């Protein structure tokens, strides 16, 4: 809040595009541009290369994830369900 009160990243859009639309965009704009922690090296190098594809600067590992987030809640849920079904089937 040093410079802007409640816009931050969406301050580049200025007065345009509507306050509610900018507020809705802000979450995605922060999430896609935020660098995550790579769970291969432990470094904060996971950067969104393109839509749904993330790249590690150090590991050079490319992971197919969400469009704006590294891991989506739907992906986590489906992974857990698939693991549970695999364990149930194999016993």
Partner RNA sequence: AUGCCUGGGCAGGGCGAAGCCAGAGGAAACUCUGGUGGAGGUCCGUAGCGGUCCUGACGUGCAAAUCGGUCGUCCGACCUG
Partner RNA sequence: GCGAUGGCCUCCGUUGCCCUCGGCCGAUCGAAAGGGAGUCGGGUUCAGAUCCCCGAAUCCGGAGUGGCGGAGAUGGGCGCCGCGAGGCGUCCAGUGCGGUAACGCGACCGAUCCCGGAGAAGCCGGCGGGAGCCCCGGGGAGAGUUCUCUUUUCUUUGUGAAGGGCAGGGCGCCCUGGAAUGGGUUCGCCCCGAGAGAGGGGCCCGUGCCUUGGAAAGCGUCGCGGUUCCGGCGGCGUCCGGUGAGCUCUCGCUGGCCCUUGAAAAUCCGGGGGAGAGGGUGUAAAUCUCGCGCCGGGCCGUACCCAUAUCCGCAGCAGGUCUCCAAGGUGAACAGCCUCUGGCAUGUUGGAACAAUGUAGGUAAGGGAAGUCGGCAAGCCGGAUCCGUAACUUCGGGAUAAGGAUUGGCUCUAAGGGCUGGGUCGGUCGCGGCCGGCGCCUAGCAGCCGACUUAGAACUGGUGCGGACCAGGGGAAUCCGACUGU
Residues in contact with RNA, counted by CB under 7 A, come to a total of: 37
| Bridge partners for 63 per DSSP | 54
For residues 11 and 90, give the distance between their C-alpha atoms in angstroms, rounded to a whole number. Answer: 53
Site track 5-34 with RNA (rule: CB under 7 A), x = hit: xxxxxxxxxxxxxxx--x------xx-xx-
Candidate list 27, 43, 79, 83; residue touching RNA; CB under 7 A? 43
To the question of whether residue 38 is assigned a binding role by annotation, the answer is: yes
Cβ distance 72 to 66 under 8 Å? yes
Interface positions, 42-81, toward Zn ion (CB under 5 A) = 56, 58-59
Cα(55)–Cα(46) distance, integer angstroms: 5
Residues from 47 through 86 that contact RNA (CB under 7 A): 49-51, 57-60, 67
**Residues of the shown chain interacting with Zn ion in the complex, contacts defined by CB under 5 A:** 38, 40-41, 56, 58-59
Q: Binding site for Zn(2+): residue ranges?
A: 38, 41, 56, 59
């Amino acid at each position: 809040a040093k410079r802007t009160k409640k816009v931050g990243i969406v301050g580049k859009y200025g007065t345009r595009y509507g306050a509610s639309l900018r507020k809705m965009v802000k979450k995605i704009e922060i999430s896609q541009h935020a660098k995550y922690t790579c769970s291969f090296c432990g470094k904060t190098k996971m950067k969104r290369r393109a839509v749904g594809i993330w790249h590690c600067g150090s590991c050079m590992k490319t992971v197919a994830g969400g469009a704006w987030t590294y891991n989506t809640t739907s992906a986590v849920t489906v992974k857990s369900a698939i693991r549970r079904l695999k364990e149930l089937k194999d016993q």
